[PDB]
Symmetry: C3
Subunit: 152 residues, 3 copies
């Protein structure tokens, strides 16, 4: 590697990081990365459990994002967490989530999603009237069928 940074194991765990980056310039990205990989991530992050115990790292993550107001006097913020785009257009999955090398959840380049297991919304779902037999029925579709039976 052109540059390698290593933080060795300390005597006792502490809050220090191998690399810390701060910018006070509002007009540019604090950090940028560009690469040209054939078959890998431009940025690869790996979290490894420090412990043999399979629950030890329940509160850890590979990537943690926080979105905050101005420290002194701030009235709030409207900043976004993660923004993904393709200014050229891609035919690849925009977001692809796996576990044990199996596709679990993804977002297609058209915005349609796939979830591998039973899911929950604590609210309503607005969508189009069903075409196929395995499409979700709308209240309209149901009420239209009921109207025809009520007529006879």
């Amino acid at each position: 590697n052109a540059v390698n940074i290593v933080m060795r194991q300390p005597t006792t765990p502490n809050f220090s990081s191998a690399l810390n980056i701060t910018s006070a310039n509002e007009g540019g990205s604090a950090m940028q990365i560009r690469g040209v990989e054939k078959a890998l991530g431009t940025l690869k992050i790996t979290h490894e459990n420090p412990s043999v115990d399979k629950e030890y790292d329940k509160n850890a993550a590979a990537l943690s994002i926080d979105i905050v107001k101005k420290q002194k006097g701030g009235k709030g913020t409207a900043a976004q967490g993660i923004y993904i785009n393709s200014t050229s257009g891609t035919t690849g999955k925009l977001l692809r989530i796996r576990n044990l090398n199996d596709d679990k959840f993804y977002v297609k380049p058209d915005g349609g999603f796939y979830a591998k297991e039973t899911s929950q919304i604590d609210g309503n779902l607005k969508l189009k009237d069903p075409i196929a037999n395995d499409h979700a029925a709308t209240k309209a579709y149901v009420d239209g069928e009921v109207e025809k039976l009520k007529a006879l």
Copy 2:
């Protein structure tokens, strides 16, 4: 911290970054990170509003991703935005989104998702026939009930 990089506030905002990384090697990741956190992110990103005004940073994000074709002559790209996996298998949430420390949207390790509020698909939803009373009805399920009433 082992290494600290600081960009101070400039007289006028400009496009400069504290750290910029570029690779022209197609065979490896431009950047890699590995850590062993018990209870934190391997990479932590924090966006802070530069202004007291709660709408000032509406177009900002913590993480921005772009996916582009080869600059000169490129016919397109099939690269993915974000790819998440667990080669060991994890029992943690694969994607976990909160606001004000409250779970808003997540993807479970099995691929099932949870959304806290009313959602919208500008299309159809393909899914399984309902088992529970609070499961979404399919067109099949509705049409099966209607068939029995039409019979009598």
Copy 3:
């Protein structure tokens, strides 16, 4: 830029990275970034296809995340992939996915999502009974209408 790191094109592709970061300290983030952008990402990642051929980079991504157990003897892991929060509260989209500059999929600050095209769940969807005509019908809602017809 305050710091620029460049890996030039090698004679033959290889696994080397421009920047590689490793920490063995369980008590702190291997890397942290903080910025104050008005209208950009704190971290910006760009993947560019190395080739003119629009399928050449089908297995590449801008961001790749892996979640692993302790290398020797580990029993498993419970770590999360991506964790997003706003300790201040934001009114911005928490996750916003586009292709060709058009909104394809997003998560609102309340946890409600939007998908632009037909989607699939390989399971059931638990949700609330419909209010509007374009809301998905539950099994309860359907069965309630059928009960009234069965009565007459």
